[PDB]
Amino acid sequence: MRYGHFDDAAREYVITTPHTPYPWINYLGSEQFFSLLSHQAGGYSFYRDAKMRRLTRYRYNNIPADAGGRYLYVNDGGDVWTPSWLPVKADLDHFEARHGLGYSRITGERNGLKVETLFFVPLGENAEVQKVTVTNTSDAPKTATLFSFVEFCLWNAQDDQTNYQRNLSIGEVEVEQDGPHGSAIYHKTEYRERRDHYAVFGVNTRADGFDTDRDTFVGAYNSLGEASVPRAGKSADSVASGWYPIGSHSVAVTLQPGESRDLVYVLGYLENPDEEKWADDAHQVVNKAPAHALLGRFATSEQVDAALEALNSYWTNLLSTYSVSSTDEKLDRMVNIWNQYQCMVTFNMSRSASFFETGIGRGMGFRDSNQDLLGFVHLIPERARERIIDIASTQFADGSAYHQYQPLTKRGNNDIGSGFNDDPLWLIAGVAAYIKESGDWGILDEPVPFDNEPGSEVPLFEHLTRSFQFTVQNRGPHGLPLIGRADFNDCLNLNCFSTTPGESFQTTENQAGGVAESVFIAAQFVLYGAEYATLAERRGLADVATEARKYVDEVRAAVLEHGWDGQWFLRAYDYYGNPVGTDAKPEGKIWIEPQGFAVMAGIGVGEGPDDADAPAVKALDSVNEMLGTPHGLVLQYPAYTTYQIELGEVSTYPPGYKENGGIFCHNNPWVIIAETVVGRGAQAFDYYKRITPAYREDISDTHKLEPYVYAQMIAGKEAVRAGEAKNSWLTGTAAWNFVAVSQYLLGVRPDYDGLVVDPQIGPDVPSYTVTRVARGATYEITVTNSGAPGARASLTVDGAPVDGRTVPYAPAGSTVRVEVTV
Amino acid sequence: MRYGHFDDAAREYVITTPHTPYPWINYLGSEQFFSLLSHQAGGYSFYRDAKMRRLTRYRYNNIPADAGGRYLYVNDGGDVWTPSWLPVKADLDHFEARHGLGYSRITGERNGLKVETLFFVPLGENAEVQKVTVTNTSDAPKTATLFSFVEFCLWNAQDDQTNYQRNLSIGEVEVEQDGPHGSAIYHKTEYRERRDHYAVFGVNTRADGFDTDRDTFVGAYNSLGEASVPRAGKSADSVASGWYPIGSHSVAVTLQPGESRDLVYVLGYLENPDEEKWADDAHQVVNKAPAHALLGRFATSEQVDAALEALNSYWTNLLSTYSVSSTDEKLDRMVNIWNQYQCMVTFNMSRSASFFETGIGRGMGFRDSNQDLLGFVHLIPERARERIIDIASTQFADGSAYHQYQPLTKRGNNDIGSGFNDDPLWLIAGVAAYIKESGDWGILDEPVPFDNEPGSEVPLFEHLTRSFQFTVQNRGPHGLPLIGRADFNDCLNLNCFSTTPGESFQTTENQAGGVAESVFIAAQFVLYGAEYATLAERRGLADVATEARKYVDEVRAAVLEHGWDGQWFLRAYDYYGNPVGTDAKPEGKIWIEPQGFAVMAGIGVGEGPDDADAPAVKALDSVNEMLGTPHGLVLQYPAYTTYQIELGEVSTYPPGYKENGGIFCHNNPWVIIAETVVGRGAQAFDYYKRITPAYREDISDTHKLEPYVYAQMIAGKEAVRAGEAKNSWLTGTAAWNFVAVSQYLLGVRPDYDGLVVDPQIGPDVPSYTVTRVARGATYEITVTNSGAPGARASLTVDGAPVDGRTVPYAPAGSTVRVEVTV
Numbered sequence A, B: 001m002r003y004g005h006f007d008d009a010a011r012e013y014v015i016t017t018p019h020t021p022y023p024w025i026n027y028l029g030s031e032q033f034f035s036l037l038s039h040q041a042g043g044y045s046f047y048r049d050a051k052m053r054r055l056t057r058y059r060y061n062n063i064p065a066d067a068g069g070r071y072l073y074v075n076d077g078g079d080v081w082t083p084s085w086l087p088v089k090a091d092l093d094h095f096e097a098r099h100g101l102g103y104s105r106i107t108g109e110r111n112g113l114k115v116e117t118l119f120f121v122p123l124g125e126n127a128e129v130q131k132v133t134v135t136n137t138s139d140a141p142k143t144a145t146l147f148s149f150v151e152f153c154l155w156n157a158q159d160d161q162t163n164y165q166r167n168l169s170i171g172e173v174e175v176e177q178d179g180p181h182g183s184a185i186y187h188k189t190e191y192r193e194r195r196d197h198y199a200v201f202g203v204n205t206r207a208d209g210f211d212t213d214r215d216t217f218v219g220a221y222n223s224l225g226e227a228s229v230p231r232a233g234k235s236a237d238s239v240a241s242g243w244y245p246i247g248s249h250s251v252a253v254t255l256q257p258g259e260s261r262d263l264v265y266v267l268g269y270l271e272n273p274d275e276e277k278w279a280d281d282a283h284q285v286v287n288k289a290p291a292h293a294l295l296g297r298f299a300t301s302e303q304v305d306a307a308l309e310a311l312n313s314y315w316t317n318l319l320s321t322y323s324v325s326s327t328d329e330k331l332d333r334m335v336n337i338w339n340q341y342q343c344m345v346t347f348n349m350s351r352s353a354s355f356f357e358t359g360i361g362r363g364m365g366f367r368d369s370n371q372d373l374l375g376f377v378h379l380i381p382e383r384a385r386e387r388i389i390d391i392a393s394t395q396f397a398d399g400s401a402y403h404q405y406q407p408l409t410k411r412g413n414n415d416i417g418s419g420f421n422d423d424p425l426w427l428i429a430g431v432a433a434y435i436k437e438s439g440d441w442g443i444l445d446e447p448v449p450f451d452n453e454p455g456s457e458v459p460l461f462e463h464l465t466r467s468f469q470f471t472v473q474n475r476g477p478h479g480l481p482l483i484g485r486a487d488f489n490d491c492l493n494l495n496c497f498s499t500t501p502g503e504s505f506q507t508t509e510n511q512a513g514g515v516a517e518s519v520f521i522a523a524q525f526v527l528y529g530a531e532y533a534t535l536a537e538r539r540g541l542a543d544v545a546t547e548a549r550k551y552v553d554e555v556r557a558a559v560l561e562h563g564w565d566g567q568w569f570l571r572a573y574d575y576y577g578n579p580v581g582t583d584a585k586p587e588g589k590i591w592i593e594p595q596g597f598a599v600m601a602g603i604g605v606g607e608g609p610d611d612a613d614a615p616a617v618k619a620l621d622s623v624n625e626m627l628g629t630p631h632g633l634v635l636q637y638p639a640y641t642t643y644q645i646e647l648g649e650v651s652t653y654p655p656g657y658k659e660n661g662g663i664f665c666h667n668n669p670w671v672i673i674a675e676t677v678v679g680r681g682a683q684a685f686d687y688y689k690r691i692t693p694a695y696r697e698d699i700s701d702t703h704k705l706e707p708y709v710y711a712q713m714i715a716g717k718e719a720v721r722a723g724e725a726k727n728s729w730l731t732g733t734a735a736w737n738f739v740a741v742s743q744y745l746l747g748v749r750p751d752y753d754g755l756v757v758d759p760q761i762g763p764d765v766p767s768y769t770v771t772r773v774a775r776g777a778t779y780e781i782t783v784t785n786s787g788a789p790g791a792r793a794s795l796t797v798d799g800a801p802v803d804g805r806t807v808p809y810a811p812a813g814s815t816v817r818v819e820v821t822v
């Protein structure tokens, strides 16, 4: 069973029923203002920060799900329906929802009236525009009233949902029926005090009426599906005082057969300078100038269409950096459109706001934003350069860091814990990737404060040395890095020992002492320590580089000596010094993360893919045999069936979910990449397909979530719900798969001085072409691929054969033709 | 005009319609387990802590309000309806909700089936029991299937609403269709790990079938009001795995004409010792002994009836301490039933969990629980004793205190602020009222820690001296006490100067320095300073008592010299030493708190009610002229129309709401008592009537909220919603009005050495009889009352006239007959 289809030419996913297994959403906007838009028009908008500047209210875990969004009630001769289907659920003759790049279009038709809404966030605007086209599709004239509807939230979503004792008395609006381009409603809660910002909701016509009070619009004892006002057929002209402000206009339209009318609605976010806050000397009336300017920019359909065409050109431009043409259209749509689009969204949202993340506790993750950069750097490197500075600024002088920062303020906080010892290294990961991509070595000289302290700036490079040294000076008795609160796995809490309910493993106090070490961090360190060494040698820091390589060698020696179980890598040593992830325990025998990552670091790699004796092969075969399911690879096996007090959160999940035997998808690309490292492209591609949206569209009823984006987790073999995903959209899986497919499968990756072309995808993709713009030159890379295990590529460049797989960077403006034979 | 009526003989409020202005609730339970129950079965239940151990989920700000609670869907011939009206909203032939003392009955009849549900929490039990009675009222045999419905919360309410990324994978249940007494469902989320507790939802019958998974029971795209399972007339026998666990059983009923059946449903909270959590060695099956025992205790109608009678007897015995028989039945029902019931609820809940307080951030307020004692000490003094020790234990060594504590742990926290300088004196208030009531002088020698520090214990009396000394040593330039974060008005934040949005004033960092002083804390110091000196005298501390009265005197002199504005008392001095609440300012010229409280402390009292020269009289007259309204006295006049950065949170509310021009009811009884102190009984009683539930029942459509309990705030004169209440049930208004009316109007009040009988209620209650049990003896107080302004009482006791108005305490077991003439 499927619920829609990809449309590669329009770069859309087309949903053909409202009856999906779950609400399927798109993200609007890519700059500073964002909207979550479901296929039923549900969701909300915020400016910069989903907790602190949320414009409109949304209910997570509503009954039913997703009843709450931007609605347009049509009253046609007393019959009331919404083209989004929800909330009225009147029978529709046609329904369709198209999610595209930065816009969606939702169409519903019933009894000869077709209503189509195009939704998007324009470039350079802090606003969500809707363009509504109403068409008479019957053979008689029609007269209908359209009631727009949005529910405001009081800015601070946390306060909005818990602090009624205060907030039910503060709701404030103004109403401007006869504005310069049509009618507007102004939501200005707290603008009388410290807020310099307000929201507008307006339409490009003089409305017949309005409502700004939820209770009046909907009616006592009514859900949104039963709203009184649209049923009555006329606006109640309600002016809110406290309670629940809304934005709503009514417009009556008369249409002859085949005739249509357009309407443009804007929900905008505005700020004024402090001394330009008020229209009047008494400071009672809001200064509407920036709201009138905004409404003036979307007063016509023409203005809307121009914006939508610009947004398209922005996306075409964005997608011109990496693309592929092959015999596999699933592969292609993922690589050309969707995985890149998703990577923009994760770069913007980190893990804060989705239909699973609530946009309250989580801000921008230190580890999360660094990893996202890996799939984002080729898109817009100037924005990646900024993000690195923002991130490194939340670093402490001892090289440890705040685990996340608040998007509005860019200041770090401990709301989801502190002292994750894998954090510091991801910074090196992010800078290495950015430099390989852009060649912008000057970033290493950027002055960057610790903990945003004015006057504490040092060069970025120095933050990396802090990161590196943090791990050097925090190893345990085996030479492996101390784990601290948790490593890459948030639920491996080895310093916790909590027997007190209700307090979060993420924020709860940890024990000083013990000897808990992480095999994962060991690998991470070998990988990014080597990169650090490379940056040091290039800054001209010979002793530093030398010293750095001595430490890397030591730590990799320790992985081989103390971090190997026999058929796989060990996961860790607990508080007590006992091994975690050994065949000597009955549960949690093998954990996936060090298998993927130690192999990417090159640890235990042998002569080739057929070297059954190499540790890397052995590890990967164990991952194949014990962790493999048709939905991907589970995190560990077997899952823990009882609470293991020494391991923290991990065994708190029922088997087969999240970190206790779920397919935690973001560690899957590591095994994929590893598999290419040992020369088993076939298997790597196999693993790629198990978790990839386009190959799972065909089991939409099982996956349940959006079929065009990666999800955080898919229930494992031990779950009753095996195969069903949770937490879609916001996940490091997106950037990690992008890195996997674009760089190791298809094999095109930037290095410092050239572009590496090293295909390893197996025989399912026998021929394909990649166009990669790197350092202002275009590389047209034509691959003939036999997929033979261990077969690695040879190159010709502009007709001459070359040595190895690195193509030195041509000058800006050239086109370089690479012919690849595997 | 009205939506129901009082039933005095029954001690119930009878709601005669589903269509009330807002949801109107009762609180079930008075010990450690509590239920919020709207007159449509909405709300939820918790054990000890509304945030930490919430059994069942409830959505604030739902659309519509209060779609969600304890539902019984009846399916008769495919017609589906609920006796609570919501969620299904089927037309009922008959509907009625009776809210009583610790129980409620809700009845709905439709097409020949009457369904009545009695809800209560039994004494000694952590459970909510429902006894369902279905009656066939038609002339022919009838059949139906009943579906019970409750929605589980995942225990931590904060987590339940914000952390779906984790918690959608942790919901776990057990199904027990053939238990010892009928069918039961177990909610056991996190029992796997740190929780030693689970919930049960069971019925005294072998159910036809069950459901535990919300989406299956309700169906996709459906609201509660459209649940699929009841509509199909058959349970789906769903076994939840994550997502949203519910409890539901189906039961088939057959009824001859006139015949009824009882079903008993139980929602229970159960714990096991750690060593007996599990029924099996594998640890997958919860040990059910306690649940089987609880279900056995309510297996029959008889067991239910006996518990309901024990509950009635408990309430009769609680209400036997203070009673009045008078010419005014509204005054009688308030004093005899409702205001005492409300005091029980506030003692138990503080301000944490109502239909407006969301039972997340607020625990047990230091100041609020001290004031709640004033209204509660006469009901159950033993628990008042315990409360004082729990409270005093969260005090610091310098005499300042944690502003609130967490109900589950009894540990103080700062989640809603620090350093409110009025806090320490409330401790003296609470103890004095406890000692006056009980005569338990030995509580002062109770050893009490600071901040629960093992080894830090001092006698309770030392805590009081720490409080007393905190004020003496924290005065400013005018001799008035420094205000700190705020005083009793939380919105008066004179050390704030916040220009930054999104941070609670309550919680935001305060400024060092400045000279901000409170006139309210001065009048509070004067009153309770004097009470402390008296406690010191009794203990033999003549040195301490004399110094103490000296300070009280210094402060009293300071208020007359530096806190008097001309026609009323001054409110404060701001950070820079500018007066607040002076007639020299255009806004907030007069504030109510110091007016009632200074006069309660006897500041500015003259020769009598007609001593026009006296500050107290000038102050009270100005309160009357400038703050008075048909709905009560507003906090200050005029309201602030613009943000006053130096006053903090107060000017942030729009005019006429909450602290900015609202009737903040809990400060009205001070003015009442003040009016009695000064001899203006008529005026005092007037004010009493303006804010009292019984006297406002006639305007239910205007008050909106429950007509049988006090609310926090009634929208004031300057607000478009003037007369509309918010924040019902949980307010110090209840303790303070009970004080006012029981002790100062009717005039019956315990002193240290005898019972004072000092009526001051004016001419509208010419005669009444108070029955007061004090110190083991019963006082029968027969009052004949001219009401003459200023006229005070003379007494005769057991046939003999006496001097003054204090009847020294007679022995336990006596009945003393006091004849009173005013």
Ligand SMILES: OC[C@H]1O[C@@H](O)[C@H](O)[C@@H](O)[C@@H]1O
Pocket: A165, A166, B416, B490, B491, B506, B649, B658, B659
């Ligand atoms: O923290 C609780 C306090 O919050 C303020 O926002 C309200 O105005 C007060 O009435 C309340 O006591």
Ligand SMILES: OC[C@H]1O[C@@H](O)[C@H](O)[C@@H](O)[C@@H]1O
Pocket: A416, A490, A491, A506, A649, A658, A659, B165, B166
């Ligand atoms: O704080 C965020 C973390 O919460 C944990 O409870 C989850 O299992 C993790 O997957 C998540 O990253």
